[PDB]
Symmetry: D2
Subunit: 285 residues, 4 copies
Amino acid sequence: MIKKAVLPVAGLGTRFLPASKSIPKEMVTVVDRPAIEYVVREAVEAGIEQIILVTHSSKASIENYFDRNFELETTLEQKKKFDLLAEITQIVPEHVSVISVRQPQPLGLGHAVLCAKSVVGEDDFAVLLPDVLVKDGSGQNDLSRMISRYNSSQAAQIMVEAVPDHLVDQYGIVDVAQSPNEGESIAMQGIVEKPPVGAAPSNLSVVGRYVLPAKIMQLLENTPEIQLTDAIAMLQDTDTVEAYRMQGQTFDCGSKLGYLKAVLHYGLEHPKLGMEFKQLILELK
Amino acid sequence: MIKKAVLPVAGLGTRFLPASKSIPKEMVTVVDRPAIEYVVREAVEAGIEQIILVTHSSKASIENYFDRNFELETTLEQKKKFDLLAEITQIVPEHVSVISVRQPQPLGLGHAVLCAKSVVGEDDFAVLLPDVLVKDGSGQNDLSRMISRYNSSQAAQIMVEAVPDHLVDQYGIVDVAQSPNEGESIAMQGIVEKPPVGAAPSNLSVVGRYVLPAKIMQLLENTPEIQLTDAIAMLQDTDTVEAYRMQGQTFDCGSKLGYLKAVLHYGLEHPKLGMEFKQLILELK
Amino acid sequence: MIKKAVLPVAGLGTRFLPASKSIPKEMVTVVDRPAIEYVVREAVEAGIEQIILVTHSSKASIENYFDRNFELETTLEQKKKFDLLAEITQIVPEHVSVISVRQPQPLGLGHAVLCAKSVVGEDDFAVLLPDVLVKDGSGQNDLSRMISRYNSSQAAQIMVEAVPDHLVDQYGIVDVAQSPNEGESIAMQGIVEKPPVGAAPSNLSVVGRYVLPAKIMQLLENTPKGAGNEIQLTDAIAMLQDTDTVEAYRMQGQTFDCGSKLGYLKAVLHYGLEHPKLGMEFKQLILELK
Amino acid sequence: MIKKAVLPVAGLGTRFLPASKSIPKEMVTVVDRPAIEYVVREAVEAGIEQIILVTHSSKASIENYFDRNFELETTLEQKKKFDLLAEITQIVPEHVSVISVRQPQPLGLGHAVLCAKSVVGEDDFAVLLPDVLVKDGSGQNDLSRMISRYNSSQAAQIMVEAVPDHLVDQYGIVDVAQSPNEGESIAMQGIVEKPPVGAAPSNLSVVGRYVLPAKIMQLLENTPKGAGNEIQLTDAIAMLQDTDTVEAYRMQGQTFDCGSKLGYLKAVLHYGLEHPKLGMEFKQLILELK
Ligand SMILES: O=c1ccn([C@@H]2O[C@H](COP(=O)(O)OP(=O)(O)OP(=O)(O)O)[C@@H](O)[C@H]2O)c(=O)[nH]1
Ligand SMILES: O=c1ccn([C@@H]2O[C@H](COP(=O)(O)OP(=O)(O)OP(=O)(O)O)[C@@H](O)[C@H]2O)c(=O)[nH]1
């Protein structure tokens, strides 16, 4: 049922500078590969088949990464390095397609999603914010848990995670009666942006993963900058909308410390370099 | 009904070299603008709303041309040149979208179209070969004549034009009982590629404009290189397929002489420079 | 003798839109190649060895033009188009180097030439404005003549061409005593911008070809007007006047301004006709026009 | 004294895939900036003024890094992030020029340095391999020491570092008589590639930092092996031996090979810890690991 995902990648990264000065914030290297690969992986391992990049003129290198590189391939055949040729050819299955649409101007997330309207048509769809990485410890990643819940419930889904009470002021936070269990959804009434450290209706931050109906493109055409949460509220007035509580862990690769935490955590766990990396950490003091 | 058009632009141009050495053959300048603009114009003036570029890693400059250029725009505001700012902002209507999908490898036109399968879905669609320019003398361009004929007849359409008998050997040529009139279609049985100057079943060359059903994506998955005409033949075995005979004139911007003929002909007729150009020609001898 | 040339190619090409919305002005097709090829050819046929491109972050396609393209070469081999592959491989003699340096911000032509300071060092150099094409010549080209002149005289050289009396307000024209003969120089004491139709000191227009000494870099670092128009080349040449002779060289040849849309079409026509292979078939296309 | 450095940065980065599939190896994030920033910093802190990038047609992002980004600057202004805008504006001292020349085909390191011939001219120059980071130092850095050494002695200088006896087969190691002290040089008579574990002429590894005279360009034009491995730098330095002293300089500091995936992670760790702002909070992330 849910086969399309919008990845809004058009935004420059003022928060991961100068790393992203001359390359997309999404192509910054997490262990041995760009951060966007962990996000595209996440989508594909949860049944996506059309990755829709809403992109900017400065970000060919993102499209290129999921395309074939003639000169680099046919100097891994001139040399005899077919292990590597495997790492640059088979990034996503033959049946997964990567599409591009440009965001003319940076008029917000809701505007980004709306640029995708031509491509999503009547299909429901996932939204995945590339600067957030999500790490699963099971065999069903939180995007898949969330999609199967959309599929049965037919309620829009918004991935959330609890934050310390003293930082609710840094995040979108959901208006929810009771906090659901790790892995399940509750009904939600709306999102409060950056509520003061006293007056939040939960400790559950909007993490940056959504499943939404085609309907919302209409809603986005008619908001009071176009911001997503406005269209999500407008959705309240017709349908049920649930907040999904993730089982996994997040890293904001936008913040310098969230990216250094992603390198450490994803590195300890790399198939090959994990044990040799664990070693390099031990040798430090 | 017919709202999507596939523009296969992934092919390098060995025939317009060195012009296209470091820029796409499609961005070569015809009077005062890239050749791709005449083709996108053609599609939009005939009711297209999703231009689908099947593209290559070397061709960002094509996507860029239909996107906004921050630094160039906001030094036409620092300067006070709003006539020009009009020529770089309003290339295609707000409601026309430009989509990109990459052709991994150059496995032929039929492969190019098939790369578009994710985006076309069940919709019927137009195919427009960018290195051919088409010039109309009426108020209905041959792509529009051809689309309205698909719409009523439900028969796939293949734009054709008559060639001298001594050059049938340079072109795809249609197998057709009688030649239709300029502006109308006949039934056709197949295309013969480059038949010898004796044994052609008509003098009507395949010009490089099609209207096809979604069906053909299935057909293209199952051809004996994947070449379009094979899938078109396979279509014969189920549906009627008509050859449309254009009222207009062509220029192959692929050949050095067809491009010099496009500059002359399109230049004599430029809103502003037409009369000043006509002048420059007169002054020559 | 003179081995180095600065091509300032960092402009956003506002005069030639939308053609240059998304590719350099310098990569516009004149017949069958980009304009920049005709300017590099001209330099090279005058013994220039080092082409110094003062460039902008979107002008990679200029640099790619004089470099080798793997995927393009290998598709030409696979099609056994060997003469073509030989042409797109030898764009510049093998002894010719193409360098790049960035113009950080677009502060005009003197600031652009100042950006080549480190690559020019103590050498004397030509400047070629790439938006001007200069065609025609019996033997050696106008740039060669003007260089042999800089070599003998050791006077800065500024290429000028005679314009009709009623258009001298469209041009920088030079303060000279008498107009020299075609292919000769004369001392000049200033250039006036868009002089008034009545009273201009000659009919000889500044063309966009210079031979200057390294000295000029030090002068470009000490010309005012930094916030108004930023660094003006004519102001630095004015300062050179104070210690050094400066001469106006008069072309034998004929220029074409591929900055205007209408000068571009003049060039396509004139180069088209003279094209060694298409010229005759292109004349044929013209005749057939009515 | 020594004002010029060639950074050969034209490789396709096969050792560091898929990280470098679609961005230069040289633009890989080490903590919070690309690797190339650390190599340019090092050169500059040793009085290098002209950075000469020998580059490939896909390495624009390297050149864009040391240039100004209009759209990026104007979005930083609109967000009143003025300290950041000041940082991304002054990446290199204002007296430092970054030049580019293309390596037409990938024929190895001597062919790359030969591509800088026209920009080096008669000047003596450093070569810095950008895939090697060199950290640490009490006062002036290893490259400064090695340059002041090239200045006094007028002997080609090759930076070497002591490796464990059982790994000398992973390295080019130098034929020296005695190993010098850290921060000192000694005459060397050859480098042997991956010498055998038993018998190597020292434990001092070639690091990828050189000070060479212009002479070497003429030698690089006359070293054989053109079709085998193409032009080898060690072959040209061997030929320099024939007329000129050549010395091995021993680092005070410590290198990191961001060509391997595992040397990259060493660098991130060691630079992370020493990062002037994140170091302490990054140590904190390590402690919390179990
Ligand atoms: O107009 C918009 C806004 C946001 N986004 C998407 O949302 C995120 C916005 O990325 P930003 O560039 O806005 O975030 P940042 O961390 O650099 O911080 P500031 O610039 O606010 O200081 C990115 O993931 C982007 O792709 C868009 O694509 N377009
Ligand atoms: O695999 C293919 C084949 C063809 N095409 C599309 O069809 C045309 C093929 O363009 P070509 O590059 O094949 O044509 P050319 O005129 O340069 O001649 P040769 O290379 O054959 O010598 C272009 O319009 C291209 O976009 C593709 O997009 N992909």
